Design a binder for this molecule. Structure first.
Ligand SMILES: CP(=O)(O)N[C@H](CCC(=O)O)C(=O)O
Ligand SMILES: [Zn+2]
Ligand SMILES: [Zn+2]
Length: 474
């Protein structure tokens, strides 16, 4: 039978870590039909990958694009960097379930202004009706759970409220969620104690689902914070992921030696533990006034009362207004910012850990976003692999494909093998690179030649109508 698509003349890096090999790839009915010599095989569509690498589409394990499938459906910031699948609902905040009327959280604003969904089934129904550009897997946020179950989300939960959150989690998992996420460094999640988190972890563990976590503190208390979530995994057996692992502030640079060692002790004991990073020494989230006097070069990404301040340094704003930086930050609220507080050499060492995946952590709603939104994966390929030689291209591709699929349980994805879904990316290994900078954070990558999602082209030319992305129901 005629192939729907064929990619010939290139070198395949299938995600297994095996050395690249010269071979063609054929696609039929959304899946990889064959791999080998297809030069003379008839195909409806054909791509010449001569001089390029043909690999599995990249899986962004740390997305916050929950509401973008309806707000900004193009998802060009993903496809332009080779991403074919994204895991949303991270750091305790997700599209569903909806908070109780009146209950809110600063971190939720980062997802966008679209009213949140009632529950996971409602969210997935919306995605089924308006198919996403790329595949979407979803985690349920602990913040959402607390905001949906507690009339006072700043209190300790009653036995009934704890059970309510567990029941909501169970429902979400039955609906297809891949697990739940926590944002322990943010309200209301920070209020949670071990019993509350372990209770939710037991529900996920029972169904072989995940607990991805933005730990309690990533600065002075980073080691204890890692220990806290590892203790949960150890005691419940729940597969765990340490989100955007890092060490903030000069006095904490180098502590990854200790945190990674603890992570190793945990996985040696049988607990499934992984982590992810974005390739930059600056973080980005809501503007936190308490940081105004401890971190220099805080750059505003957005501000509701002062939208003219996006892209400006807090110090320059405060100087102009004639007030101290803390006062200026309070006047900018609600707002978001970028914090340059990590050691890039350490970021690289963390990425080298065998269980580290790539998570862009892009904030698509930001007026002047952190460039990781558009350049994370290509920065890894161009700067971490080609420029720094932190690992081979074959190893890096595995971290972006097969590893994520294994950690999140995505059957028939993350690898180029017959029968698997045809999520494919074709790129030039010598030119692939990010172009997004701190000043111009939305510049598209170079070196990405084409991207297929379930066998359909999404890059460089997006589909005219219905998009190829699928909801990855666990
Ligand atoms: C929305 P988020 O929780 O994924 N952003 C974190 C903030 C880390 C920090 O500065 O506390 C980051 O950029 O790593
Ligand atoms: Zn986070
Ligand atoms: Zn996040």
């Amino acid at each position: 039978e005629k192939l729907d698509f064929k990619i010939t003349g290139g070198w395949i890096i299938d995600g297994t870590g095996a050395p690249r090999r010269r071979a063609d790839l054929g696609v039929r009915d959304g899946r990889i039909a064959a791999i080998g010599e297809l030069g003379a095989h008839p195909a409806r569509h054909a791509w010449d990958a001569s001089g390029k690498i043909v690999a599995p589409g990249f899986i962004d394990v740390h997305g916050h694009d929950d509401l973008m499938f309806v707000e900004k459906p193009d998802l060009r910031w993903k496809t332009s960097q080779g991403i074919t699948t994204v895991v949303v609902g991270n750091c305790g905040v997700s599209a569903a379930p909806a908070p109780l009327p009146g209950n809110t959280a600063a971190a939720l604003a980062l997802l966008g202004e679209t009213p949140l969904f009632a529950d996971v089934p409602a969210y997935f129904a919306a995605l089924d009706a308006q198919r996403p550009m790329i595949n979407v897997a979803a985690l349920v946020g602990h913040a959402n759970l607390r905001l949906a179950a507690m009339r006072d989300p700043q209190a300790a939960p009653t036995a009934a409220e704890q059970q309510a959150m567990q029941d909501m989690l169970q429902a979400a998992l039955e609906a297809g969620a891949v697990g739940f996420s926590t944002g322990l460094a943010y309200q209301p999640g920070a209020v949670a104690q071990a019993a509350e988190l372990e209770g939710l972890a037991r529900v996920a563990a029972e169904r072989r689902r995940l607990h991805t976590s933005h730990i309690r503190n990533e600065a002075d208390g980073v080691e204890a914070a890692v220990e806290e979530v590892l203790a949960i995994g150890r005691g419940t057996g729940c597969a765990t992921v340490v989100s955007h692992h890092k060490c903030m502030m000069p006095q904490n640079w180098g502590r990854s030696r200790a945190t990674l060692a603890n992570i190793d002790r945990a996985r040696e004991q049988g607990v499934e533990v992984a982590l992810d990073i974005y390739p930059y020494p600056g973080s980005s989230t809501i503007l936190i006034p308490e940081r105004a006097e401890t971190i220099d070069d805080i750059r505003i990404t957005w501000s509701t009362p002062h939208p003219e301040c996006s892209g400006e340094y807090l110090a320059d704003i405060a100087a102009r207004w004639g007030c101290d930086k803390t006062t200026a930050a309070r006047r900018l609220a609600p707002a978001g910012a970028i914090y340059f507080a990590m050691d890039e050499d350490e970021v690289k060492r963390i990425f080298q850990h065998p269980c580290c995946m790539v998570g862009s952590d892009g904030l698509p709603n930001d007026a002047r976003p952190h460039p990781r939104l558009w350049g994370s994966f290509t920065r890894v390929l161009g700067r971490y692999v080609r420029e720094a030689r932190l690992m081979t291209l074959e190893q890096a591709v595995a971290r972006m494909t097969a590893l994520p699929a294994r950690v999140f349980g995505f059957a028939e994805r993350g690898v180029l093998q017959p029968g698997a879904w045809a999520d494919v990316v074709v790129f030039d290994p010598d030119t692939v690179a990010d172009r997004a900078t701190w000043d111009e954070p939305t510049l598209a990558s170079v070196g990405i030649a084409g991207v297929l999602v379930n066998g359909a082209e999404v890059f460089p030319q997006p589909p005219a109508d219905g998009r190829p992305g699928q909801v990855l129901r666990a």
